[PDB]
Amino acid sequence: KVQTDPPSVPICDLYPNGVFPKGQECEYPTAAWRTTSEEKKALDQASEEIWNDFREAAEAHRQVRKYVMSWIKPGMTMIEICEKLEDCSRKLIKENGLNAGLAFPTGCSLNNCAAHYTPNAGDTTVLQYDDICKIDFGTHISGRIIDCAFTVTFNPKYDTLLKAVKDATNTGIKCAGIDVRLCDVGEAIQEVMESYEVEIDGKTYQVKPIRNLNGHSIGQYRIHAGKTVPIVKGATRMEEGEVYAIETFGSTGKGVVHDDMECSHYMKNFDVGHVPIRLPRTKHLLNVINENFGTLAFCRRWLDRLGESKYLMALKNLCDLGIVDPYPPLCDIKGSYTAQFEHTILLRPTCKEVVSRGD
Ligand SMILES: Cc1ccccc1OC[C@H]1CCCN1c1ncnc2nc[nH]c12
Ligand SMILES: [Mn+2]
Ligand SMILES: [Mn+2]
């Protein structure tokens, strides 16, 4: 009934009465009347089993990330890192089809690559001492997703770039709240990130937010629910009961990402309904996706793990039909360095809970 070393005990077995620990609770940016309002307390208690699912997913995410930090080292292949992390995540979340599991593939994007890189089979990439690696993974219970990421480095030359991005993410978390404008969250993040200047191998940079990357609302089994949180200047509001991934990306490059490298990430389009398919390999792959992932993102390694082979044409057919969308790695210019920090927040009627942050 205590967690093992390495962790193998499901979070569900660690909390025998089914009540999971809350994340950090904050007052909204006076908004104090919310924590004692009898109607807000009733409205909060109404969604309690929902918050409880996010909390179970968040405790699994915190235990996996402390475990990753203990062993991630240069010399490991990216496949080895992803498999070791996912093996742990599956055990702690007590994976059970679409009821509990991994919410999206483990990102381990390196250097100028900011996001959506996970190795496909046969990728020989090895983590290097000078690499800047963004570990971004997700867990869910009943489709209540925790989207939380951090940057791993071994060389102290990146310390101030990581501090800039962490400070910008924390500013975003602080600025966020019920009825707060999303563009106001974006402007606060940019101001903080751009106050930092960094020196890396004798070159100086003013840290740039990646202008075409952003935070986002989260929906049930829907990593992007439709609202985006900008990380640069340039007036939609946050609403009560919403869930957001507050994330920032800092870059020493142009502060703009473009699609590059082989695609690993894919996700069924939430707006496309039932589409009958007769093509047998394409029909089979769609059934595999519907059974195992639904509208959650998946990667090619996860198809290989399910025993699927020779599915690339079937997968391209699904993309061409608009049923599945590809999400290729997003990179800034060659030679640039990118960092990321991300947390999931619940906009509860009574308080703001940074559910992925322990407290
Ligand atoms: C729908 C959509 C519209 C526009 C842009 C991106 C996007 O979807 C991108 C999703 C699918 C792949 C992985 N995706 C993730 N989205 C958010 N945060 C993530 N953290 C790790 N993977 C994450
Ligand atoms: Mn993420
Ligand atoms: Mn995200």
Side-chain angles (χ1 to χ4, degrees):
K1 67 110 174 167
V2 308
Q3 190 56 274
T4 54
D5 178 28
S8 62
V9 188
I11 304 307
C12 198
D13 303 338
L14 296 176
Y15 298 88
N17 282 340
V19 185
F20 303 95
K22 300 169 180 283
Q24 175 189 33
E25 289 171 316
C26 314
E27 283 197 346
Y28 284 107
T30 317
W33 64 274
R34 281 184 185 272
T35 187
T36 62
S37 174
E38 210 91 298
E39 52 134 25
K40 297 302 181 190
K41 284 251 260 81
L43 209 94
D44 181 47
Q45 199 58 35
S47 277
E48 185 63 39
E49 289 318 280
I50 297 172
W51 315 141
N52 197 55
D53 288 345
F54 275 111
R55 284 167 196 151
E56 181 177 1
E59 188 59 24
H61 199 291
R62 279 188 287 275
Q63 297 192 20
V64 173
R65 69 195 190 253
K66 190 181 268 243
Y67 171 54
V68 177
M69 288 306 298
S70 81
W71 53 251
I72 191 171
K73 288 300 189 305
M76 292 185 75
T77 65
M78 302 320 293
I79 289 182
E80 279 158 6
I81 293 169
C82 290
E83 287 185 351
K84 196 170 172 175
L85 186 159
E86 293 166 3
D87 279 353
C88 184
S89 192
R90 294 179 195 281
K91 284 181 195 294
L92 299 200
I93 206 65
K94 195 176 174 67
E95 191 175 33
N96 178 22
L98 293 176
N99 293 126
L102 313 188
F104 49 78
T106 304
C108 52
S109 306
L110 303 166
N111 303 322
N112 63 307
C113 182
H116 300 163
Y117 164 81
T118 196
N120 286 328
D123 187 328
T124 58
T125 301
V126 168
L127 184 60
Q128 302 303 134
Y129 171 80
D130 292 318
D131 284 348
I132 176 165
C133 178
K134 284 65 76 183
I135 294 290
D136 186 346
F137 67 98
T139 53
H140 79 90
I141 295 293
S142 308
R144 305 311 178 170
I145 300 168
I146 295 298
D147 186 359
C148 177
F150 56 97
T151 300
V152 171
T153 61
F154 304 101
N155 192 324
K157 73 184 182 178
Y158 303 114
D159 287 348
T160 54
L161 170 62
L162 265 61
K163 191 171 182 179
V165 180
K166 180 95 105 291
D167 193 11
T169 295
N170 288 331
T171 293
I173 294 161
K174 287 181 261 160
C175 187
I178 300 166
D179 273 61
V180 171
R181 296 192 287 151
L182 290 165
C183 180
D184 286 345
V185 178
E187 196 174 314
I189 288 167
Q190 189 181 15
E191 189 191 336
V192 162
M193 224 193 277
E194 291 180 351
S195 70
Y196 285 88
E197 52 181 10
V198 300
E199 185 187 359
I200 303 173
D201 302 304
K203 189 172 172 200
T204 66
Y205 311 89
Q206 187 180 261
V207 185
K208 296 222 255 296
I210 297 178
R211 67 187 184 212
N212 59 338
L213 286 178
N214 33 70
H216 47 96
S217 55
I218 294 174
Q220 199 180 16
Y221 297 100
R222 206 181 186 179
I223 190 62
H224 274 254
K227 284 170 169 191
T228 66
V229 191
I231 64 179
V232 295
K233 90 260 280 168
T236 306
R237 283 166 163 85
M238 289 169 56
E239 309 209 313
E240 178 190 62
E242 290 183 329
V243 180
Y244 284 85
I246 303 296
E247 56 185 322
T248 79
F249 292 83
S251 179
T252 65
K254 274 225 231 256
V256 191
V257 293
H258 63 265
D259 293 345
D260 194 36
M261 311 192 291
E262 182 169 281
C263 192
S264 54
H265 288 53
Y266 302 81
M267 191 169 64
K268 214 179 132 201
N269 184 322
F270 200 93
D271 297 331
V272 177
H274 173 68
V275 177
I277 301 171
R278 276 182 176 180
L279 291 170
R281 300 189 173 272
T282 306
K283 181 190 190 68
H284 175 77
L285 183 57
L286 183 56
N287 287 339
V288 169
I289 290 164
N290 288 333
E291 292 169 23
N292 289 279
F293 314 118
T295 57
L296 301 168
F298 58 94
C299 61
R300 293 195 213 176
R301 284 185 296 109
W302 290 359
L303 294 173
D304 297 340
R305 196 184 157 267
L306 292 165
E308 294 300 321
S309 61
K310 305 169 289 293
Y311 56 77
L312 293 186
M313 192 67 73
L315 181 61
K316 186 186 185 74
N317 292 338
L318 296 174
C319 292
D320 296 345
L321 287 161
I323 296 163
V324 169
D325 295 317
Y327 291 91
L330 300 168
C331 309
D332 202 328
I333 62 168
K334 189 191 162 168
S336 68
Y337 304 108
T338 63
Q340 182 199 10
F341 287 93
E342 172 175 35
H343 274 297
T344 293
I345 66 163
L346 313 170
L347 305 182
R348 289 172 48 211
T350 58
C351 67
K352 171 175 51 182
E353 184 176 349
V354 191
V355 67
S356 53
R357 177 132 81 191
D359 210 43

